[PDB]
Amino acid sequence: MWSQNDAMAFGSQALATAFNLDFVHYRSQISSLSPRFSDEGFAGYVNALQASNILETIKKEKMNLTATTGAGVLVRQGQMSDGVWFWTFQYPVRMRLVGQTTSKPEQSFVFEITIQRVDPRLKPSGMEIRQMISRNA
């Protein structure tokens, strides 16, 4: 298993979960995503949320975050010095803060995600995101 197509699907699934957040349950949604990331990877997600002021806006304005991930592509793959295989993908992502009475403007990005292999004895997916970088599109 662990084909590049499997890894691409893992990344798009992670992005879908990461950026569809509910104004009531967002903290629990976010913590539940941790298994998809290394802790350094998760820092990139936290940075992406902060760069768009997501958490404060969700909390203060009672807005949900919605997002759609487009078709992604493999940039490169290989192994690190440690013999651990990785894949780097980029995906278009559009997201929008949406409230009951109104919304914020949609924002468009390309996310770069590097996924590395993990011992399946530790994480049964055998994968985790070790780096997440948001770029404006």
Author numbering: 90 to 226
Q: What text appears in the publication on this structure?
A:
DotI is a 23 kDa inner membrane protein essential for intracellular growth of L. pneumophila within mammalian and protozoan cells. DotI has one transmembrane domain in its N-terminal region, followed by a periplasmic domain13. DotI is conserved in all of the identified type IVB secretion systems, including the conjugation systems of R64 and related plasmids. Structural analysis of the periplasmic domains of DotI and its R64 ortholog TraM demonstrated that DotI and TraM are structural homologs of the T4ASS protein VirB8.
